[PDB]
Ligand binder design. Sequence first.
Ligand SMILES: [Cl-]
Ligand SMILES: [Cl-]
Ligand SMILES: [Pd+2]
Ligand SMILES: [Pd+2]
Length: 129
Amino acid sequence: KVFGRCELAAAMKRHGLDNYRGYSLGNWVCAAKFESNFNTQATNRNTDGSTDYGILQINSRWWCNDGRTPGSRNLCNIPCSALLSSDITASVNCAKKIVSDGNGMNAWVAWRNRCKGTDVQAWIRGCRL
Ligand SMILES: [Cl-]
Ligand SMILES: [Cl-]
Ligand SMILES: [Pd+2]
Ligand SMILES: [Pd+2]
């Protein structure tokens, strides 16, 4: 599923991402925009053989099991396919655990390089939340 900007903003809000660990909703919407272009089915292979899945490009190296990432961890305890679903719960819930790690949203390189320090509130401008 390709989410609408405000549609994603609202779903993320309902799952309690607005100001989760101090990250305003616009940060999360911005991160999803540059990770997946709001496409839940987005996948990308890493140089190490791991793969990134879903709206927030969660990496099989640490966070999910895809059956093809030798020696990886599954810290969210999900099959990676669960992160490609039209239901964003698995991605949001997993992302909550990721952002609790020492680095916060800096774990998402796209966030750091495209969202951090920018006007992320522009991403939710005009949405009914
Ligand atoms: Cl398990
Ligand atoms: Cl649901
Ligand atoms: Pd388990
Ligand atoms: Pd659900």
